Structure formats: structure tokens, C-alpha cells
Amino acid sequence: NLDIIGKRIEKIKQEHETSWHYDQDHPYKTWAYHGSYETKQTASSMVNGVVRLLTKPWDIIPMVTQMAMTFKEKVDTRTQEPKEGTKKLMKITAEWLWKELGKKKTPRMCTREEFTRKVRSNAALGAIFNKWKSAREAVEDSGFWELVDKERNLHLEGKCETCVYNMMSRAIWYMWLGARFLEFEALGFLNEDHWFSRENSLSGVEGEGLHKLGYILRDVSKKEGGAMYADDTAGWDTRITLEDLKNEEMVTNHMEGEHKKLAEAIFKLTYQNKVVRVQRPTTVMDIISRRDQRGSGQVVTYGLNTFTNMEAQLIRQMEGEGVFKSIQHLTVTEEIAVKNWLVRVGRERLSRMAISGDDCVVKPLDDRFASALTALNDMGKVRKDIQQWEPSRGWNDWTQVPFCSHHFHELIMKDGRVLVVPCRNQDELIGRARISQGAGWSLRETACLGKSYAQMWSLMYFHRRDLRLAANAICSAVPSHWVPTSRATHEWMTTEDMLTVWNRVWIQENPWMEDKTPVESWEEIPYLGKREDQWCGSLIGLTSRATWAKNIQTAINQVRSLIGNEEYTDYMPSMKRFRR
Ligand SMILES: Cc1ccc(NC(=O)[C@@H]2CCCO2)nc1
Ligand SMILES: [Zn+2]
Ligand SMILES: [Zn+2]
């Protein structure tokens, strides 16, 4: 308690000594509360006019138009301590998993140099605005790094002064850039050196790309076993237990020297003890603390979520295979049996999974997995939208399985080669491309964001009639040389010809494609079946859509007139119906 968080708490008091008060009407049950002080402040979703003017049929589809309009009673909940047998299963599995992940990787500190290059090319590091304006400016000022040094030497001393969370089924905990640096220095290696790549972790898909996920799920489907399970957890970050945080911290057992001490301090001082500021309109700032739940930077959050999910799913596989009888207590000989299972089949059982943070797909040895719920419930990883003791419903076809907000189609090219393509309901794709975040967008910057969406569509959703047409329209409407912008692998963020990029991604660099014959035109690249395209949300067959497609050059010219006298290319004749 207060010997680890007091100093952060003490320091905040003094900066608002005029305003401090232990409010007696505080809403917190599960968070420890310390005091309150005076503030007054809050960023809505803005519409991208370039994308909207070129998707007119969708202006009357509420599933699209409602996306641009507009649980903190899940953060204020508690998770019970797991049973002794569950705690033993988790410790053995976590110890074994950090060893496996460490066999071909070397933990190492990330550098000021590396951190500086990140900020100077826009990565969402979840910092706050004070002394300097932006992240770019703080990193170029030696005073900042002296603040970093003071904290850093404080962490080597096993103490913390300035690493404080700011709160804002989502919850993003911003810290000041300095605290983010110290997190990146100690634990950035997990992401920077690809610890959760599929090659290194067997279950992971870190860095794989949306064009590979479908092929990965089809490879899982080829294994002998039961149904494919894809159970979502209800509020994963809120169900991370102190026992989870202690098993995650065992990565420090693989470290040495300074790095070991710096990482032990991030885990002890910022993860296993936390200090948070929350805006309450009743507008004061509340300073609350708790030991458990996830509240790290989003990139460290991804890797540790992947780790703990891999651990949880291996234990649920052990339960279905009858490796242990009860979570109440592991006998001495069940411990040897669990250890022996991991050594003997651990790597095979990891390859039966695709895991991206809290999101998983598991093809277990058989369907006993479906009703193996005691370890999963007791670890606090309670399934969403199913009763606690009701057996999981599995998927019989890898093309029906949800993963990373998509499903995957098998699409055969006119030349017989096989594409496995990502897909989701087309209203979600068009509704997201119509939204921008943040203020002060010029018309040029808005156009370049529309171009990023259009290029992603050409690369990942070319098989959807309406998106290949809308992508061609947007690329025809935005000046040819203007560079796509945004505020896993993003191959569409380029000014290279999209047919050349398509060839590189789907043919040349695609390890599931044996014949490397380049495609010469977009007309060789297939669509879904017309009925499948409608099932997944196409407007093909509607009067509104036919008028849009027929008159698309008039829409392209409306946008060109707004942007002005610039160099444009006509990409519409890449499509058969516009090719005269
Ligand atoms: C593991 C993984 C890899 C890729 C993706 N998603 C994407 O690349 C796109 C960018 C915009 C939303 O979808 N999601 C998960
Ligand atoms: Zn600190
Ligand atoms: Zn689909």
C-alpha cells in the first residue's frame, strides 16, 4: 500500500494544496480512494468529406451513418483470488512459456534513440500534453531527459514519483511521455524484437498482417481434432488478477544487470500498484489506486495479454485432456504430469492456437475442451454472452470462425491459384473510412486519409465489388502524387502502384502461393460470388448502387473541383465495365 504509492500521492496533493479534500460522496467500491482537487475540461468523431462524397448510397444506411454520431461500471469491479491448484497451474505454465519464448530471443533495453525515432514518425504511445506542446518537442529538449533520469534513478532505488495513469468496453490509461519512455526502455523488447511472432511464439500472430491471418486459421484447421473455439472474454483487461501480473513479471528472471532492476520496477511500481486520475463531473479530479487489472501502455498491454491468453488457453486444453482432476489442489504427481505434458506436447498445443491479445481461436485435440470450464472461470477469464457453466459452441468450418474482427473466404482465381482473403460486414468498413479523429485537418490531409483507406481496400478487400469501385474512385479523386497519411503490417501506406503492391503481397512474398507468375491487370483479380458479396453487405443489385456506379465520374469530378487544379489519374478503366 501507501509506502509504494504515497510519494506519487504526496506530490499531487502539493500541486493543488488550495483544492485538496477527502470527499465523503466518492463512488469507488473496488478502487482505494485518496482525495480530490479542482479541474475543468473534457474529442468527438469527425466525418471525412472526401470518403463520404464518394460513397453516396451509404448516406441513407443507418448502420453506416450512426457510426459517426455520439463500461466504467466494469472497471469498478473485483476478481476473486484463484484456488491453489489454479495458481499452481498458472505458475508452472508461465515459467515454461517465458523459457520457450526466450529460447531464440535475448531480452534487452530499448534506447532513447529508438524512442526518439518512434515519436518522430507518429506512433500512438498514449502520452499527455505541462511544459512542452507535443511529444516531438519534449524529446528534442535535454531538460525532459533530466526529468527521465531523476525518475530512472528513483526506480533503481525501488521508488516512484511521477508514473501516474490518467483515465479516459474500452479504457485508455495515458501517462506522461517520461513514464512511457521508462516502460518502453524496460519492456519494449517484447514488441520491438517480435517475441509474439508466429515463428517465435507458435500461437502468436504479432506482425503477421491481415493478408496472412486467413492462411494461419486454415493451417490450424488442417490439424486433427475437434471444433474451432473462439470464445471472447467479458472485459479481458478488468479480469487480469494480481496472480496474472506476478506470472507476467517472471520475464525479469531472463534479464540481468540494470535491465532486470528497471523492469522489476515497472512491474512492482506501475503495474502491481497503480495511481490514476479520473474526471468526475459531480468537475473534480479523483486520485484512486488499485493493485490489479491491466493498465500499461497499449503495446506492452498487447504482448502481456497475448502471453496470459496463451497460458490460459493451454491450461483449458490441459483440463479437456484430463491432465489434472480438480483446480482445488494439484497433487505432487499432477505437477509432474502438467510439467511432462508441456515438455512432451506444449509446442504442438501452442500451434493449435491463433492468439492476438485477448482474442483467440483454439482447435483442441477433441470437443471435451467445450465443457472444460473450471480453470477458465476460476482464473477469472469468464466468457462473454454465454452462461458460466454452459459448454462453448465451436465452429465446424474455418471460413465461419471470427478472429481480429474478420472472417476469411477461400477465393479461386481464374488461373486456379487460391487466395484466402479477410472480410467483414461492408457497412463496418465504409462507416470507419468515413470517420477522422482530432481537429485542424486541412482538405489535403483529409484527402490523404481517404487515400490510405482506399489503398487498404484495394489490397485487403479487392474481392468486395463496392470497395474495389469506391477505392478506384477515391484514388482517381485525390492527386496521384499525394502521400497517404494516418494520425500490423501496413503495405497500403505507399505511393507505389497498387497492382505492384498487390503482386508483392498476394503472390511474390506469400508463402502459401507456390506459382509466382505475376498478375498483369486488376481484371485477373477475382471477386467473391455475387450472392456471398451481398451476404457480407454489398449493395450490388440496388438502384441507388447502380446509379452511383454508372455516374461515378461525376462524383470523382465533384471532389476534384473542391481540391482544385492538381495532377489526377483516372483509375476507373482498371475495371472491365469502365474499360469503354
Ligand atoms: C493481428 C491483426 C493484424 C491486422 C489487423 N487489422 C488491420 O490490419 C486493419 C487495419 C485497420 C483495421 O484492420 N488486425 C489484427
Ligand atoms: Zn515511476
Ligand atoms: Zn465475408
Side-chain angles (χ1 to χ4, degrees), residues 217 219-231 312-322 341 345 348-355 360-372 392-396 401:
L217 290 185
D219 277 351
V220 169
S221 81
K222 281 174 185 158
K223 299 226 162 216
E224 296 298 324
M228 295 182 71
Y229 298 82
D231 296 339
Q313 303 304 320
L314 274 179
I315 294 164
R316 178 177 177 184
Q317 291 194 66
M318 276 166 213
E319 190 171 343
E321 285 181 47
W341 190 87
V345 299
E348 198 277 344
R349 295 302 192 267
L350 286 174
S351 73
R352 283 177 168 274
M353 306 196 290
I355 304 192
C360 64
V361 174
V362 185
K363 189 163 180 175
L365 204 69
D366 50 64
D367 297 311
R368 294 172 286 168
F369 184 95
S371 56
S392 289
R393 295 180 272 286
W395 299 90
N396 298 128
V401 171

Side-chain angles (χ1 to χ4, degrees), residues 74 81 96 137-138 153 173 189 210 218 222 232 252 257 263 269 286 301 304 348 360 421 466 489 512 555:
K74 184 145 226 165
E81 182 101 291
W96 174 86
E137 288 187 350
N153 282 282
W173 306 29
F189 72 90
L210 196 60
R218 182 181 75 169
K222 281 174 185 158
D232 280 343
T252 59
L269 303 175
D286 295 286
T301 293
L304 297 184
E348 198 277 344
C360 64
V421 298
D466 297 347
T489 78
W512 293 281

Side-chain angles (χ1 to χ4, degrees), residues 205-211 213 302 355-356 403-406 424 429 432 453 456 460-461 488-490 492:
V205 290
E206 191 278 314
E208 297 303 317
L210 196 60
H211 57 289
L213 299 192
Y302 178 82
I355 304 192
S356 199
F403 190 45
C404 303
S405 306
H406 289 73
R424 65 199 283 186
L429 292 174
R432 306 155 84 70
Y453 275 101
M456 162 181 91
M460 296 299 109
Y461 307 121
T489 78
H490 285 214
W492 57 88

